[PDB]
Amino acid sequence: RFRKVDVGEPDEGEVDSCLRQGNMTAALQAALKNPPINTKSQAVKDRAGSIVLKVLISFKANDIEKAVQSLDKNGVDLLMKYIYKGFESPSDNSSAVLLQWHEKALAAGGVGSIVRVLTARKTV
Amino acid sequence: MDSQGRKVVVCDNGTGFVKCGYAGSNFPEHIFPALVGRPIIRSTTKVGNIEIKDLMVGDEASELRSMLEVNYPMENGIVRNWDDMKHLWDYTFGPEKLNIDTRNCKILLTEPPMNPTKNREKIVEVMFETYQFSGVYVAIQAVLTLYAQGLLTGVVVDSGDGVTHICPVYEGFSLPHLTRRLDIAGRDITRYLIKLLLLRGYAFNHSADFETVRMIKEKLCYVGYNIEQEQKLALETTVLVESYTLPDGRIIKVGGERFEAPEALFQPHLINVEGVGVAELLFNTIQAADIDTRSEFYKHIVLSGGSTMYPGLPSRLERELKQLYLERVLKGDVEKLSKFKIRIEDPPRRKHMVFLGGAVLADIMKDKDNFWMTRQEYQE
Amino acid sequence: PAYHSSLMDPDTKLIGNMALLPIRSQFKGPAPRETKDTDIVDEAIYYFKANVFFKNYEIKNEADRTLIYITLYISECLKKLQKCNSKSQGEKEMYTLGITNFPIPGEPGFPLNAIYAKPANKQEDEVMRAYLQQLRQETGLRLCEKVFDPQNDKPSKWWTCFVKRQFMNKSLS
Amino acid sequence: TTALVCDNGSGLVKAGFAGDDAPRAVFPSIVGRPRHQGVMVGMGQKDSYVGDEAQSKRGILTLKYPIEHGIITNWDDMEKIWHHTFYNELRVAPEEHPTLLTEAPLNPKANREKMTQIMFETFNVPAMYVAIQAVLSLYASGRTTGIVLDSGDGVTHNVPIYEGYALPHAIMRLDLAGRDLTDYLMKILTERGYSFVTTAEREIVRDIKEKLCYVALDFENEMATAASSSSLEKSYELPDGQVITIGNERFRCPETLFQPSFIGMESAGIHETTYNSIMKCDIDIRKDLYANNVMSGGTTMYPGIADRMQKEITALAPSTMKIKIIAPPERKYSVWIGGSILASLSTFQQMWITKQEYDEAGPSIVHRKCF
Amino acid sequence: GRLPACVVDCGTGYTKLGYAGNTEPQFIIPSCIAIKESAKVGDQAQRRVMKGVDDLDFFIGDEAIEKPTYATKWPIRHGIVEDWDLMERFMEQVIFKYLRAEPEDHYFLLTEPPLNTPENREYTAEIMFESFNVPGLYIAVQAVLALAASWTSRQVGERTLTGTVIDSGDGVTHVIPVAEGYVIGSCIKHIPIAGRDITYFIQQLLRDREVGIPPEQSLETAKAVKERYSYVCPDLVKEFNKYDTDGSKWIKQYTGINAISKKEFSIDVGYERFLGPEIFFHPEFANPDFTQPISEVVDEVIQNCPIDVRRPLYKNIVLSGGSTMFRDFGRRLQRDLKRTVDARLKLSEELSGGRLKPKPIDVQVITHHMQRYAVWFGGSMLASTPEFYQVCHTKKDYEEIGPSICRHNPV
Numbered sequence A: 001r002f003r004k005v006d007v008g009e010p011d012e013g014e015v016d017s018c019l020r021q022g023n024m025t026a027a028l029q030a031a032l033k034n035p036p037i038n039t040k041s042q043a044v045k046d047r048a049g050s051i052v053l054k055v056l057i058s059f060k061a062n063d064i065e066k067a068v069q070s071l072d073k074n075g076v077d078l079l080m081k082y083i084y085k086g087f088e089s090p091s092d093n094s095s096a097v098l099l100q101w102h103e104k105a106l107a108a109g110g111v112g113s114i115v116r117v118l119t120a121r122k123t124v
Numbered sequence B: 001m002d003s004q005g006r007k008v009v010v011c012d013n014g015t016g017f018v019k020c021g022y023a024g025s026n027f028p029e030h031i032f033p034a035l036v037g038r039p040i041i042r043s044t045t046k047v048g049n050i051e052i053k054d055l056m057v058g059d060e061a062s063e064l065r066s067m068l069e070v071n072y073p074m075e076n077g078i079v080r081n082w083d084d085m086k087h088l089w090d091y092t093f094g095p096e097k098l099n100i101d102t103r104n105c106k107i108l109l110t111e112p113p114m115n116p117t118k119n120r121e122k123i124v125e126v127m128f129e130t131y132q133f134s135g136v137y138v139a140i141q142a143v144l145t146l147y148a149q150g151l152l153t154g155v156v157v158d159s160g161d162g163v164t165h166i167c168p169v170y171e172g173f174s175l176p177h178l179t180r181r182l183d184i185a186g187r188d189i190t191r192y193l194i195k196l197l198l199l200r201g202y203a204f205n206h207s208a209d210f211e212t213v214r215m216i217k218e219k220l221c222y223v224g225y226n227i228e229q230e231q232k233l234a235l236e237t238t239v240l241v242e243s244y245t246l247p248d249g250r251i252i253k254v255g256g257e258r259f260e261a262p263e264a265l266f267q268p269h270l271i272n273v274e275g276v277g278v279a280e281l282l283f284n285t286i287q288a289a290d291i292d293t294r295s296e297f298y299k300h301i302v303l304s305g306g307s308t309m310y311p312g313l314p315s316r317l318e319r320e321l322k323q324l325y326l327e328r329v330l331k332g333d334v335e336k337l338s339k340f341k342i343r344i345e346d347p348p349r350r351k352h353m354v355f356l357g358g359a360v361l362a363d364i365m366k367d368k369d370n371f372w373m374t375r376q377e378y379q380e
Numbered sequence C: 001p002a003y004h005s006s007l008m009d010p011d012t013k014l015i016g017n018m019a020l021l022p023i024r025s026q027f028k029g030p031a032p033r034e035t036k037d038t039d040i041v042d043e044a045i046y047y048f049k050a051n052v053f054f055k056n057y058e059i060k061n062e063a064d065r066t067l068i069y070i071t072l073y074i075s076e077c078l079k080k081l082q083k084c085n086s087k088s089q090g091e092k093e094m095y096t097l098g099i100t101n102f103p104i105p106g107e108p109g110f111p112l113n114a115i116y117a118k119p120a121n122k123q124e125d126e127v128m129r130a131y132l133q134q135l136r137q138e139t140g141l142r143l144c145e146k147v148f149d150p151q152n153d154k155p156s157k158w159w160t161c162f163v164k165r166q167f168m169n170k171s172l173s
Numbered sequence D: 001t002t003a004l005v006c007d008n009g010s011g012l013v014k015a016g017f018a019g020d021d022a023p024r025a026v027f028p029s030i031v032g033r034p035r036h037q038g039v040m041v042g043m044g045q046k047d048s049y050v051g052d053e054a055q056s057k058r059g060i061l062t063l064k065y066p067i068e069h070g071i072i073t074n075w076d077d078m079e080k081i082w083h084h085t086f087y088n089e090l091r092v093a094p095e096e097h098p099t100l101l102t103e104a105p106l107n108p109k110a111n112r113e114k115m116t117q118i119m120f121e122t123f124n125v126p127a128m129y130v131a132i133q134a135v136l137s138l139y140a141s142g143r144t145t146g147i148v149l150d151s152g153d154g155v156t157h158n159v160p161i162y163e164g165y166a167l168p169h170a171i172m173r174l175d176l177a178g179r180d181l182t183d184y185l186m187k188i189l190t191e192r193g194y195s196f197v198t199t200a201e202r203e204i205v206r207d208i209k210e211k212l213c214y215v216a217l218d219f220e221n222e223m224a225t226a227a228s229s230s231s232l233e234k235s236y237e238l239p240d241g242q243v244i245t246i247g248n249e250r251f252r253c254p255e256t257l258f259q260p261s262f263i264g265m266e267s268a269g270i271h272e273t274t275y276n277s278i279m280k281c282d283i284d285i286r287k288d289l290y291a292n293n294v295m296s297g298g299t300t301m302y303p304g305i306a307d308r309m310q311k312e313i314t315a316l317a318p319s320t321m322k323i324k325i326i327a328p329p330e331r332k333y334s335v336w337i338g339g340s341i342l343a344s345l346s347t348f349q350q351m352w353i354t355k356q357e358y359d360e361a362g363p364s365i366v367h368r369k370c371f
Numbered sequence E: 001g002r003l004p005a006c007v008v009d010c011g012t013g014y015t016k017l018g019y020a021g022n023t024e025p026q027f028i029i030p031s032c033i034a035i036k037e038s039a040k041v042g043d044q045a046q047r048r049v050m051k052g053v054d055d056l057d058f059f060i061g062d063e064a065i066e067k068p069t070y071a072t073k074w075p076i077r078h079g080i081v082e083d084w085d086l087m088e089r090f091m092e093q094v095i096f097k098y099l100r101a102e103p104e105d106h107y108f109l110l111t112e113p114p115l116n117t118p119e120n121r122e123y124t125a126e127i128m129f130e131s132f133n134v135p136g137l138y139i140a141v142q143a144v145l146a147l148a149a150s151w152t153s154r155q156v157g158e159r160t161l162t163g164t165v166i167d168s169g170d171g172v173t174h175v176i177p178v179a180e181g182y183v184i185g186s187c188i189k190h191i192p193i194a195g196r197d198i199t200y201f202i203q204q205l206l207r208d209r210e211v212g213i214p215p216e217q218s219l220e221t222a223k224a225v226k227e228r229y230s231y232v233c234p235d236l237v238k239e240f241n242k243y244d245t246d247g248s249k250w251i252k253q254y255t256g257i258n259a260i261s262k263k264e265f266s267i268d269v270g271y272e273r274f275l276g277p278e279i280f281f282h283p284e285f286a287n288p289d290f291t292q293p294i295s296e297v298v299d300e301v302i303q304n305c306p307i308d309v310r311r312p313l314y315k316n317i318v319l320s321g322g323s324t325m326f327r328d329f330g331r332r333l334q335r336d337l338k339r340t341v342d343a344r345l346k347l348s349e350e351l352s353g354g355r356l357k358p359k360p361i362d363v364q365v366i367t368h369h370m371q372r373y374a375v376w377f378g379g380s381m382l383a384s385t386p387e388f389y390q391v392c393h394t395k396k397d398y399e400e401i402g403p404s405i406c407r408h409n410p411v
């Protein structure tokens, strides 16, 4: 008894238009414009993450160099925050390609880019 | 020192450690264990050219213990062998340490509360009939820690080596009918730690081993803050298993024993002491005091002595006092508990707050009349 | 437990850390000679068979350092008697062991420098060595009557099996 | 059938049949639980022990008293003691025997309401009553006027009664009794080094107290005498043949009845509490109360307590009049005897609470009938 | 009908097997396992590895003690399982070959030493509940079974629920005070000496003197000497004198047969008659980490118990287990306690000043006839009672709580 009690207590139309135009490099940059990391809601996060994934899986594997090196370092770190989000929702195809995007963003951003995923107080 | 040039020594003769220095000092000179030992031959340990005297005392006896039978001259605050205590005092005032000409000194002793009568009588005797001190006093553990804290009101929770005492004092008035003794203290936690290390397959049995397991305790043991989460941590993960190196170089692994052993202070039945733990025994002391004094006692819980130094004891003791108060006084008004004001005074210097208190008192009263028992007033 | 030196009277001279008990003996040497039959060497000889098994031994009397020295030396004497083949041949040998030099307290080879403090007086050295040599002389000659079985003069099966059991794992050599 | 009498003492339960002269059951009001979890099987037979088996086995048992300061504190254990009384000590089915219980004055009202509920709903007695312990003492003394000092295991109380009328405003209560005298004895023996502490070992100090304690007729003269001669020292053999020794501690123990300051009470002593209650009655009554002090209850058995009380009151009261302390030898059982008398009288049989009344009035009935 | 429960007492020296209700065990077997010799394999850096069905090629008990081509491993040490690979195989053949019990239909009573580290209870529960799939299990405590085995054989008046159990097996010795049928487990003391330690002391003490005993059967001869020529002596220094002065009475001849060839050999049996048993009273002979005689640990155990139980414990000291039945064992222990306890009372009487001369304490040591198997018998009596089937951990509990269910034991 005497010690029982608890006490002392993204623009989907812009992305679609870029993909349907085939402007793949801009389609990535279009997705990375305005991340809802500032925003409290969950649905807008899963929305934004799904829109980013739509680009990554529709990217051709050989072009990931031209994709990732186009981004600025603040973009490359944001790409990493979206990559580690994709792995939380496996599928037949998604993990096989996200693991490749990871290794090219790793060359661009380095291990320090991953620390700014672990340490960020905001979920993208 | 005194105006007459008389040195004013202050001297705690604990069952664990002698702590003996001059009045007005902020630190004790010369901490050493209250130990006596005698040379023996063991067939299993190396002998060398280190000279072992026919009797050794104190610090030297504790470090050469590997070739000594060793004895603690005092237990539970009671002198067991007056001959070994004479030797320990002879070392204390001796050339090894306080090299005082005792016949010219004033000495402040202390005595535990509610101690046996003839113990004090024979202590006061030897000070005038063998050391010939120029003046004596026998201070009380409770008031001394209050001088070291500068307070006039509080409940002292003096947890030494041999025994633990709770002593209320209110505005300088004593409340001796509220004194409570708890038989668990640091010597029994060490006996208990031995009994647990035996269950992991180690062995500790010789007199020299008792001091080694004491140092294991002081290094590794801690009071769990929330015993359920400590047990969960030990079962879920290996992180508590921490190594130690015996003087023989044998490595031992210490695990959940680190918190099981101190826990006897809060669940006395674990060492077959019948009663209630220090937190509840303290609470039952406050609730016995006159009704309006209670709200001051909760604001001045004062800890003292080395067996309080376990990491987390103040934090744990706060938690239980709050749970006791919510259970028994507020009847579950968990919102109203937020108004409960409780302070556990946990100065890091508290390991020596008794001696520090005596050095304050003797410096305040070095030259006054009615304080010191003089050898002129003795022998009548 | 162990067996501890029983014969120390309320007074008897202590040399270094070691009590100059009597020794009922025919040889020369400083110690008293008269009114004895039970004796410090006989206690060592009577206890030895038990006293070597105890693994822990507490020094509490200067006369223990006397008895310990005999109990150590008996484990040197048996090392000779074991190889002999007659009481006469051992007894003759034991004279030469008794004369043989052994280290004194505080020497770099003495086994128990931690417990025997070194002497310093010239008369203390001579009295001590004269006593220790007298102890050795009798201790050997006592065993020669006891180790050799009279039925065949050969060193006895029983006493000789203790040769591997040095007292307290301390050699005297 | 014949009524049972069941004095639910704080210390000893005293029980029997109405009309008998002495209780057919006396046993200690303790409930014991095993200290050690390690039962075997068959043996280790019960979760808890009650009464005399809990004294006998006590070394393995933590003992608790269901009554403290005369108020029932653990009803589950108190029910266990009542169940033990009827089914084991008396071997009586209580559903057909009226049972007279007892209580101390100035208790909480909720105490006796809960008490009467259990009798009618668990033991389903036909009838019962709840008399005040002090009033019962005059029945055993065979008189109708006097001041009763009853001091038990848990409470000391005074009820003055004149010509068969109680004077409820002069009733006084003091929570010193045989419990606190034992804890004080258990304290003062630390001056010798005789630690006890264990609740089992408190029962040994209790026996030490009963067999060696006495009240000094002049406390300060006896204290100065104990400083001079060994004559007061009496040894006692503990169950393991350790022989303790006790000196001035023999009478310092009961002295705290007269100097409650020894254990930090602010109250006046039992003599002055008695005197203050007489000085609270009307002038014409006082003349009779001084003549008829009746002592009752266990702690009044201390040797010399009659003489000390008589000495002390005669120093406070006006000197022109006789003060006499009535103290029969059976004063330990006075309350049970007085119950057995009351339950036997023909004039009493009309005033039983009965099941048919409880069924309509509910537990509050006890506040209406038993006055 | 309803099948009787199984009782298995996996001692360090011997394992006792049988079913509840029988007066004695159906098998007593040596606690060892013989596994196929394999040193010819290229074990160049690691322990042997198992293939195929070869791991079933083992024997246990008397089939295992002297096989010509199998290595006799001894998997129990100090009472604790040291290798569960060997123990799980040992249990496999105990259940299916010796007991003939199908384990999925019988409740099992197992036993443990009070030193048993909790992980061993978790492991033993895993093996019984998952490998053998028992319906229910109970890890009983050896001391209360020993006292019950005494109690149930006691005549009226001696039949009592309080007594100091001293269990001295092959591996370790325990002093365990029981009062009112509750084990006062916090007062338990352990003495690190047992039949193994006595045997090795004789084994050394022969090899120092009696070279001629074939090493392949040195252990057999030390064990046989201990079991038949040894006794607890009154004191050493008089016994050595007794042997030296009258050796024709005290020295005995033991004659052994060499298992290789069949030649005789013979040895003089001497000081190892009373040395050996002495190590109970002087553990420093065989263990340097211990020094209290058994007749002192007993008094320390009792003098920690509550003062009201303290006398009943001296009145009913029960010896149990194989190592206690040396001749004159109890006669010496009693003589020591009735010295130690009397000296205590005399001191307190003197300090009382001759007033209240205390009533004595009659130390008594009792030694019933079942001691080779008393723990098993107490188990077989318990396992016949209806209440046994309530206190067992039922399989449906383990399938909810997991092995943690067996974490606790009566401290």
Ligand SMILES: Nc1ncnc2c1ncn2[C@@H]1O[C@H](COP(=O)(O)OP(=O)(O)O)[C@@H](O)[C@H]1O
Pocket: B013, B014, B015, B016, B017, B159, B160, B161, B162, B185, B186, B187, B190, B214, B217, B218, B219, B305, B306, B307, B308, B309, B310, B311
């Ligand atoms: N760092 C520590 N943490 C916990 N316990 C300690 C620590 N240091 C010492 N102790 C314990 O506190 C005691 C040290 O002696 P001390 O506190 O001076 O007691 P006393 O003053 O009564 O002799 C010993 O019992 C020792 O085991």
Ligand SMILES: Nc1ncnc2c1ncn2[C@@H]1O[C@H](COP(=O)(O)OP(=O)(O)O)[C@@H](O)[C@H]1O
Pocket: D007, D008, D009, D010, D011, D012, D151, D152, D153, D154, D177, D178, D179, D206, D209, D210, D211, D297, D298, D299, D300, D301, D302, D303, D332
């Ligand atoms: N011979 C005696 N002398 C002094 N006190 C006694 C004696 N016998 C019993 N007592 C005290 O009497 C108390 C019990 O009082 P009693 O009236 O019998 O119980 P209750 O008050 O509960 O009815 C016990 O606490 C015991 O200490």
Ligand SMILES: Nc1ncnc2c1ncn2[C@@H]1O[C@H](COP(=O)(O)OP(=O)(O)O)[C@@H](O)[C@H]1O
Pocket: E010, E011, E012, E013, E014, E015, E168, E169, E170, E171, E195, E196, E223, E226, E227, E228, E321, E322, E323, E324, E325, E326, E372
């Ligand atoms: N008559 C005897 N005298 C002395 N020791 C014996 C005797 N008989 C057997 N022993 C020893 O007792 C040891 C322990 O036996 P037991 O208690 O059955 O083993 P465990 O403790 O494994 O159950 C045996 O290994 C044996 O060495």
Ligand SMILES: [Mg+2]
Pocket: B014, B015, B159, B160, B161, B305
């Ligand atoms: Mg202290």
Ligand SMILES: [Mg+2]
Pocket: D009, D010, D151, D152, D153, D297, D298, D335
């Ligand atoms: Mg009463």
Ligand SMILES: [Mg+2]
Pocket: E010, E011, E012, E013, E014, E169, E170, E321
């Ligand atoms: Mg066994």
